[PDB]
Amino acid sequence: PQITLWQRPLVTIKIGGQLKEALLDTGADDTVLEENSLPGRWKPKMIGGIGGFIKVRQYDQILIEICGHKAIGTVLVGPTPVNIIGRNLLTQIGCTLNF
Amino acid sequence: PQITLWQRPLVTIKIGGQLKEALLDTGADDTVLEENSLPGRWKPKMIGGIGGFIKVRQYDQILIEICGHKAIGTVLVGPTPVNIIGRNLLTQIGCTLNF
Numbered sequence: 098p099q100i101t102l103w104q105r106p107l108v109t110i111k112i113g114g115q116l117k118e119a120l121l122d123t124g125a126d127d128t129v130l131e132e133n134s135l136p137g138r139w140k141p142k143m144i145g146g147i148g149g150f151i152k153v154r155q156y157d158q159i160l161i162e163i164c165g166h167k168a169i170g171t172v173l174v175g176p177t178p179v180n181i182i183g184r185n186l187l188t189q190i191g192c193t194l195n196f
Numbered sequence: 197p198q199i200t201l202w203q204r205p206l207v208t209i210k211i212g213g214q215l216k217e218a219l220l221d222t223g224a225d226d227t228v229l230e231e232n233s234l235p236g237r238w239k240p241k242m243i244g245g246i247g248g249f250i251k252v253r254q255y256d257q258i259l260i261e262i263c264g265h266k267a268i269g270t271v272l273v274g275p276t277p278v279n280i281i282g283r284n285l286l287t288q289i290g291c292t293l294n295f
């Protein structure tokens with residue numbers, strides 16, 4: 098599909114059985130989603146945003162269906178305002194920027 | 197042009213006589229650039245990112261050339277890690293997301 102930026106780019110995702118909406122973010126090197134009930138072993142890690150650094154929990158090799166497109170990656174869960182689809186995933190569903 | 201997300205999406209901009217590189221960010225409602233020597237009257241304002249809120253200085257009706265494309269908008273200057281091209285500008289050079 099084709100997406101114009103008049104409105105924030107939101108999408109429907111399916112992660113470990115729960116249906117959420119995420120934001121397609123080209124300025125995000127990483128995939129970071131809110132606190133969700135995720136099972137597996139994780140690791141402490143830090144990431145930065147305009148306002149600073151939140152400690153996240155780093156889960157790898159998670160299955161996520163983006164706009165009905167299946168991908169597999171590292172996802173980090175933390176105290177984020179909005180869920181974000183970063184470049185580590187957008188490359189996978191082969192997302193391009195155009196102008 | 198066509199842009200794949202293997203590498204952060206960077207671009208060359210020209211703002212009030214100085215040549216900088218900015219990041220094309222679809223998850224950014226707003227254009228926020230580092231401290232630059234900008235002239236005109238401004239206003240205090242707050243914005244939020246994953247890590248919080250920085251007070252910015254809000255300048256409106258600024259001329260900015262994006263990848264050799266001229267646009268006019270509100271730009272906010274602040275203590276940001278990287279310059280960002282938000283949606284208020286990407287709509288103007290008619291940028292779309294594609295998948």
Ligand SMILES: COC(=O)[C@@H](NC(=O)[C@@H](NC(=O)CC[C@H](O)[C@H](Cc1ccccc1)NC(=O)[C@H](C)NC(=O)[C@H](C)N)C(C)C)C(C)C
Nearest residue numbers: 124125126145146147223224225226243244245246277278
């Ligand atoms: C209003 O609600 C909001 O969400 C407010 N905030 C926003 O819209 C903000 N957007 C946002 O907060 C959306 C996320 C931005 O794209 C940042 C940009 C960034 C890239 C590289 C280094 C540092 C920062 N990405 C990130 O923070 C991503 C997750 N991670 C990184 O950049 C890491 C450190 N590599 C802007 C301040 C950029 C506001 C504009 C309304």
